[PDB]
Ligand binder design. Structure first.
Ligand SMILES: NS(=O)(=O)c1cc2c(cc1Cl)N[C@H]([C@H]1C[C@H]3C=C[C@@H]1C3)NS2(=O)=O
Ligand SMILES: C[C@]12C[C@@H]3C[C@](C)(C1)C[C@@](N)(C3)C2
Ligand SMILES: N[C@@H](CCC(=O)O)C(=O)O
Ligand SMILES: N[C@@H](CCC(=O)O)C(=O)O
Lengths: 100, 192, 188, 101, 101, 50
């Protein structure tokens, strides 16, 4: 399962308290101080980006090949077999030209 | 051109040999070694799979030889709207081209039998060679669709009854060559 | 040299060559009239279709309309498959390296598909137990949160668990003790 | 029981904030399992928003998103970073190239 | 002087573009120029075209059935929804934008 | 040599993340004066910024 599209909004999260709770100002000051300390992105690495343990981290760009296969080029055989059908049909109709 | 006198025997036996191999290939319930299921749901996760042309079956499963005739199956996450995929599924439900090849090779039998019954009215004896080439094309398209479907690495292995699908093509074209080596003189003997 | 293409395509393309190796013949032997009027026999159809396939061949040619049709179509086929051979070696003669996770233990500090541990009761364990460098600190945070135990009480156990785990267990140790497992058979 | 059961981004940032500002804290789970909104009938706030509005909790630390209607009844701090609306679907497989490609 | 029909002139340079020979040859002034330069065309076109052939045969793209988040407005064979009583649900109720509405 | 062309467009396309910039004098760099980026580099101790 996959992200498609993108953000509809410049919205975000915040810490929240009862209205007028004394925690709001120390919370907000700590939130500011954390930003220049760079904690928030390192928490985000720890909870999303390091946990990108699936091969989808890499599988879309890896080197070399498992060799090429018929199904990738099989249509080339169709135009041949159709040419051989035409090579029969031409004789099948030129019979009536020689029959003239 | 050589052995001018015996070629009617050699061609009729070669044609009957090709027909025998063709109908053994079409009739055999196994062609190759693969991984899959014994039945149209041995069926739980995977099994070593031993299917034929129209039949799905397995080898060294918890049961063996209880094969089944295949039936039409859907696809997941689109890409079925494409005519190539749709037609590939419609064919895979019942492969027309091998049995059409059987019918063409039988009609070649009738054409060579028409050497004697109402004997050789005009250059009709040419028709066997046309039928043998058309049988060749029907086999090769059958192989192409079969591989291009089932190979979708595969880690498969191919048995002799798979290779009989090819060998019946190789031999059908050798019988084509024999049928031309017949016609090219027989029609001259008819028409000067 | 066959690596760029699968077994089954090398197997089956022979059947296409056989086909063109006799379709030219059928095309030519429809009522030439003189009998000589059409050249290509089986052996020359086979040859011209081969000189189409493996390229080269500057000596024969069909005059038939249907003949030159099937010749051009078979040349178009060959151009594709052979040039596809000429291309795909680029995927083999470049980036030939097999697999090598991971340098600097970068991925180890971030994923659990490969387990890793230090020697137990040893300088390296105590170093990870204390070292504050982020890669080392996070690898320690793993090992302290990794269960079951990753630490090996002997280098013998370390090497054994590395081998039995097919490299999905990585052993952390001092490089000269490490390199005595590389300069020495089985050196795997 | 206290705070070591829980793990996650909000659990960690909660620890970091409570350590930075040096106050004792207790993580607790909303009883109704909702993020929280005012009932259109009774105007009663459910969810974690209800837990704050009716004194069931002292602070909210969760992916409970900033909304203007919530700011009518609670205070949201400065945000740590932004995010937006998105769609989740099951992805189609990587496409095998066209038959004549 | 020329072993050529019009079908021969229509054929010889096809085979030359396929980079294989045919028994006929221009054998003439101003025929050297037409036959010979035509080699340069395949010598550059084919060489360059037939080089990434393999890669192209395995690009393994994705079909991306929807990308605009508004394609879902165009259809109902794919259903869509939001978290009940959720911020996104109530925002879509509240945000009176036609594409959203 | 045509492969040596089409296999590579990116020679270096200068420096991303200011990694080599932080480690060279070969390219000079600065922030806006009297600004919160300037102050951020003044204070933020992350290795590349510092
Ligand atoms: N880079 S990010 O997505 O992880 C992200 C997003 C945001 C962060 C911090 C980070 Cl790390 N805080 C800032 C806030 C900090 C202060 C300054 C602006 C706001 C107040 N804005 S934000 O949009 O709320
Ligand atoms: C020189 C060649 C060798 C093989 C690969 C190339 C690409 C180059 C095409 C060719 N026709 C066959 C000629
Ligand atoms: N010789 C080492 C062994 C353990 C280690 O390598 O960490 C020591 O004295 O601790
Ligand atoms: N964080 C959101 C979750 C639900 C939604 O976004 O719809 C909220 O607080 O309601």
């Amino acid at each position: 399962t996959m992200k498609v599209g993108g953000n509809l909004d410049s919205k975000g999260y915040g810490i929240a308290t009862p209205k007028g709770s004394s925690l709001g100002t120390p919370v907000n000051l700590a939130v500011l101080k954390l930003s220049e300390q760079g904690v928030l992105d390192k928490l985000k690495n720890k909870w999303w980006y390091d946990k990108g343990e699936c091969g989808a981290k890499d599988s879309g760009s890896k080197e070399k090949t498992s060799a090429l296969s018929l199904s990738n080029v099989a249509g080339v055989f169709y135009i041949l077999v159709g040419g051989l059908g035409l090579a029969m049909l031409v004789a099948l109709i030129e019979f009536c030209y020689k029959s003239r | 051109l050589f052995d001018r006198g015996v070629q009617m025997l050699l061609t009729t036996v070669g044609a009957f040999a090709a027909f025998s191999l063709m109908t053994i290939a079409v009739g055999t319930d196994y062609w190759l070694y693969s991984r899959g299921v014994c039945k149209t749901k041995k069926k739980n996760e995977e099994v070593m799979t031993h299917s034929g042309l129209w039949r799905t079956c397995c080898l060294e499963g918890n049961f063996k030889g209880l094969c089944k005739q295949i039936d039409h199956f859907p696809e997941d996450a689109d890409y079925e709207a494409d005519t190539a995929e749709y037609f590939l599924r419609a064919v895979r439900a019942s492969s027309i081209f091998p049995i059409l090849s059987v019918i063409l090779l039988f009609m070649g039998g009738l054409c060579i039998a028409a050497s004697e019954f109402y004997k050789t009215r005009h250059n009709i004896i040419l028709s066997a060679g046309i039928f043998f080439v058309s049988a060749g094309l029907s086999n090769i398209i059958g192989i192409i669709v079969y591989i291009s479907a089932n190979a979708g690495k595969n880690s498969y292995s191919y048995g002799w009854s798979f290779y009989f699908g090819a060998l019946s093509f190789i031999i059908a074209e050798m019988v084509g060559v024999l049928a031309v080596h017949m016609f090219i003189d027989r029609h001259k003997q008819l028409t000067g | 040299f066959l690596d760029p293409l699968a077994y089954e395509i090398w197997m089956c393309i022979v059947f296409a060559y056989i086909g063109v190796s006799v379709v030219l013949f059928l095309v030519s032997r429809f009522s030439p009239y003189s009998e000589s009027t059409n050249e290509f026999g089986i052996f020359n159809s086979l040859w011209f279709s081969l000189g189409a396939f493996m390229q080269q061949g500057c000596d024969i040619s069909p005059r038939s309309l249907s003949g030159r049709i099937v010749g051009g179509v078979w040349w178009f086929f060959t151009l594709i498959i052979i040039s596809s051979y000429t291309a795909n070696l680029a995927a083999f003669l470049t980036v030939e390296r097999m697999v090598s996770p991971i340098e600097s233990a970068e991925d180890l500090s971030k994923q659990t598909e490969i387990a890793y541990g230090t020697l137990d009761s040893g300088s390296t364990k105590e170093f990870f137990r204390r070292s504050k460098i982020a890669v080392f600190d996070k690898m320690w945070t793993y090992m302290r949160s990794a269960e079951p135990s990753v630490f090996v009480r002997t280098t013998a156990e370390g090497v054994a668990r590395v081998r039995k785990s097919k490299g999905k267990y990585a052993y952390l140790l001092e490089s000269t003790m490490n390199e005595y497992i590389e300069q020495r058979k089985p050196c795997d | 029981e206290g705070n070591e059961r829980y793990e996650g981004y909000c659990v960690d940032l909660a620890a970091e904030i409570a350590k930075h500002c040096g106050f004792k804290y207790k993580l607790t789970i909303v009883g109704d399992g909702k993020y929280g909104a005012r009932d259109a009938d009774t105007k009663i706030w459910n969810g974690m928003v209800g837990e704050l509005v009716y004194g069931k909790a002292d602070i909210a630390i969760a992916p409970l998103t900033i909304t203007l209607v919530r700011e009518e009844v609670i205070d949201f701090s400065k945000p740590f970073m932004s995010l937006g609306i998105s769609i989740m679907i099951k992805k189609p497989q990587k496409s095998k190239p066209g038959v004549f490609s």
